[PDB]
Amino acid sequence: IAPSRGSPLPVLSWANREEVWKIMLNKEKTYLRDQHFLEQHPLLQPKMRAILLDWLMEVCEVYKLHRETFYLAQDFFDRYMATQENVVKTLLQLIGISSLFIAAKLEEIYPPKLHQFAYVTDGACSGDEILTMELMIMKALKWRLSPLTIVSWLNVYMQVAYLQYPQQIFIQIAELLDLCVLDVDCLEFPYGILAASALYHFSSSELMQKVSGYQWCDIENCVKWMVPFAMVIRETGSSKLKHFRGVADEDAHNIQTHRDSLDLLDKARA
Amino acid sequence: MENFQKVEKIGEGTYGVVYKARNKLTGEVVALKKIRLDTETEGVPSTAIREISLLKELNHPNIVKLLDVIHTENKLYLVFEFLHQDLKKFMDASALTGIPLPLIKSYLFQLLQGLAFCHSHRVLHRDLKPQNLLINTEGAIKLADFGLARAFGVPVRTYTVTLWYRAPEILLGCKYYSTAVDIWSLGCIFAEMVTRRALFPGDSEIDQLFRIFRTLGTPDEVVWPGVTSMPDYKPSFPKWARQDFSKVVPPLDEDGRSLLSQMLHYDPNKRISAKAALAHPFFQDVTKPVPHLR
Numbered sequence: 270i271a272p273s274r275g276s277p278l279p280v281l282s283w284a285n286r287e288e289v290w291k292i293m294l295n296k297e298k299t300y301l302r303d304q305h306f307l308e309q310h311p312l313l314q315p316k317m318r319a320i321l322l323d324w325l326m327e328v329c330e331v332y333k334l335h336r337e338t339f340y341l342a343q344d345f346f347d348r349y350m351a352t353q354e355n356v357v358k359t360l361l362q363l364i365g366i367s368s369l370f371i372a373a374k375l376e377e378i379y380p381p382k383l384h385q386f387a388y389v390t391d392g393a394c395s396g397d398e399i400l401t402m403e404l405m406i407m408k409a410l411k412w413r414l415s416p417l418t419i420v421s422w423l424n425v426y427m428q429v430a431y432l433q434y435p436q437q438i439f440i441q442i443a444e445l446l447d448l449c450v451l452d453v454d455c456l457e458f459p460y461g462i463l464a465a466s467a468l469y470h471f472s473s474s475e476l477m478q479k480v481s482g483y484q485w486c487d488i489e490n491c492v493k494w495m496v497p498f499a500m501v502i503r504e505t506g507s508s509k510l511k512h513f514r515g516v517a518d519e520d521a522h523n524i525q526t527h528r529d530s531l532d533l534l535d536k537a538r539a
Numbered sequence: 540m541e542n543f544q545k546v547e548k549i550g551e552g553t554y555g556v557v558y559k560a561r562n563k564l565t566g567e568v569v570a571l572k573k574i575r576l577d578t579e580t581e582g583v584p585s586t587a588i589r590e591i592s593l594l595k596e597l598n599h600p601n602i603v604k605l606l607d608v609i610h611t612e613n614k615l616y617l618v619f620e621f622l623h624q625d626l627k628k629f630m631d632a633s634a635l636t637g638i639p640l641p642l643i644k645s646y647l648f649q650l651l652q653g654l655a656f657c658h659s660h661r662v663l664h665r666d667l668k669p670q671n672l673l674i675n676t677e678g679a680i681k682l683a684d685f686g687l688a689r690a691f692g693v694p695v696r697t698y699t700v701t702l703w704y705r706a707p708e709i710l711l712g713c714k715y716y717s718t719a720v721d722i723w724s725l726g727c728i729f730a731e732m733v734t735r736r737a738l739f740p741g742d743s744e745i746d747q748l749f750r751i752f753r754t755l756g757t758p759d760e761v762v763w764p765g766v767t768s769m770p771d772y773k774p775s776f777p778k779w780a781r782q783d784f785s786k787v788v789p790p791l792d793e794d795g796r797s798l799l800s801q802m803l804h805y806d807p808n809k810r811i812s813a814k815a816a817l818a819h820p821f822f823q824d825v826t827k828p829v830p831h832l833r
């Protein structure tokens with residue numbers, strides 16, 4: 270996997286950087302992606318997944334959940350669907366909200382309560398169904414719930430760079446990734462490649478290589494695929510970092526936000 | 540669960556009862572943690588989900604193994620390998636005779652290897668106490684009870700860890716945890732294995748701090764830059780002098796005292812790391828380095 274990839278981690282006092290890096294690299298071997306998994310569900314359409322993930326992001330903003338929580342839910346959803354067949358549109362909300370429930374229980378210190386996850390479904394999902402589904406998902410995933418998400422790769426990269434304002438740069442790159450993740454074709458690229466390509470669109474090949482270890486040849490295809498998405502974001506001006514009551518300013522860039530991404534998605538795919 | 544025969548209750552936590560159970564067919568002995576789903580208003584407890592996923596990622600000889608996860612009826616069973624006792628019971632059983640120093644050395648070496656692996660995975664254990672360290676009858680020791688563990692891809696914040704093994708930066712109000720808190724715990728455990736008595740058995744946060752101060756000396760900006768600026772630091776703290784480690788841990792040689800002193804350094808930024816501790820001359824007899832490339 271990416272034999273041309275170097276190790277960008279600086280020297281670490283608390284661990285052996287070669288071992289830390291190798292563990293991060295091994296995540297791609299356990300956590301798979303299948304950009305064509307929807308072919309296993311003939312009655313579904315890729316736009317249904319964009320709609321579901323966009324709604325989950327908005328749910329995350331309302332409860333001020335972390336970006337990691339949203340991306341864990343995205344990965345759980347995508348890996349779970351690859352293990353299933355013939356799912357229909359009317360069950361996607363339950364699968365999605367249950368994936369978010371699991372993700373929030375993993376990631377947040379004080380996650381919203383189950384009845385809160387049922388509440389946002391506006392009477393379409395009960396708490397008992399969410400409980401049933403979380404177990405279906407976790408068992409189908411063989412309890413492998415620790416992937417290195419797309420957004421965690423952005424934190425790794427931005428931390429290598431650290432070791433205008435980094436927080437604002439972070440949310441602007443995250444917003445491009447949020448748009449790309451709505452298109453199921455993003456799954457053709459390793460999560461690390463997707464994050465490096467978004468960072469490249471807001472920086473340079475030199476910085477991208479320094480913080481991610483990828484050579485230009487490694488991300489060229491992703492970069493070309495990502496071009497329409499980066500262009501629609503660029504034309505709008507990127508969003509601004511926001512403050513969140515109850516969230517420390519130094520953690521504000523890690524809070525999931527939501528904008529009108531479905532329209533942007535249409536303009537990009539055009 | 541048909542092939543398991545419950546043998547005895549060996550524990551009980553917020554989320555379930557723990558039983559020693561024997562595979563009726565193979566004769567295997569396991570530790571069964573039974574989670575009663577009927578009573579969990581939030582589904583599978585967040586600590587259980589986190590611990591299951593972590594243990595499936597962390598495979599290492601010095602980390603307790605999670606053998607299986609079984610969902611039967613309305614119960615979730617976590618099947619763990621069984622180790623006959625924890626380090627607290629072994630130390631108490633050895634209090635009159637003492638633990639042979641080569642066994643203390645082997646256990647500490649193994650504990651640091653398991654910890655170094657967790658830190659390599661960017662995971663803080665945060666609850667290393669003798670009750671969470673399990674031994675077998677073959678000389679092995681393993682880290683267990685990962686319920687409080689947290690990944691540190693981003694800072695792990697402190698929220699209003701057993702007192703006796705709590706690092707002084709935590710007691711003084713640090714806003715974040717670090718890998719150094721785990722090293723501090725092991726340092727306390729290292730001393731406890733040598734003396735057969737907990738090193739800092741405080742009965743309150745301030746008693747715990749003063750106990751540390753009475754042994755390692757009251758910190759100042761010279762030995763710990765930033766102490767005087769910490770939230771719970773008080774200029775009224777009494778001024779105690781550091782004690783000679785020959786009195787604190789008499790059975791230990793110079794190499795052991797050196798390692799212990801580096802594991803209990805006040806400054807978290809300077810406290811020895813798990814990987815550096817493994818390279819300490821105290822362990823030269825039990826290990827030798829590998830040729831380095833570059």
Ligand SMILES: CNC(=O)[C@@H](NC(=O)[C@@H]1CN(C(=O)c2cnn(Cc3ccccc3)c2)CC12CN(C(=O)[C@H]1CC1(C)C)C2)[C@@H](C)OCCC1CCCCC1
Pocket residue numbers: 278279281283424425426427428429431432435436439519522661691692693694695716717718719807808809
């Ligand atoms: C908001 N601040 C942040 O996130 C910080 N992050 C870390 O320090 C993270 C968290 N971490 C810890 O918690 C932690 C726990 N024990 N020790 C060791 C220790 C021991 C004794 C005393 C102190 C510490 C560390 C270390 C940390 C750096 N890690 C890596 O894997 C390194 C390899 C890499 C470059 C990717 C994880 C900074 C560096 O990031 C930059 C901020 C910025 C990114 C860009 C956008 C805005 C925010």
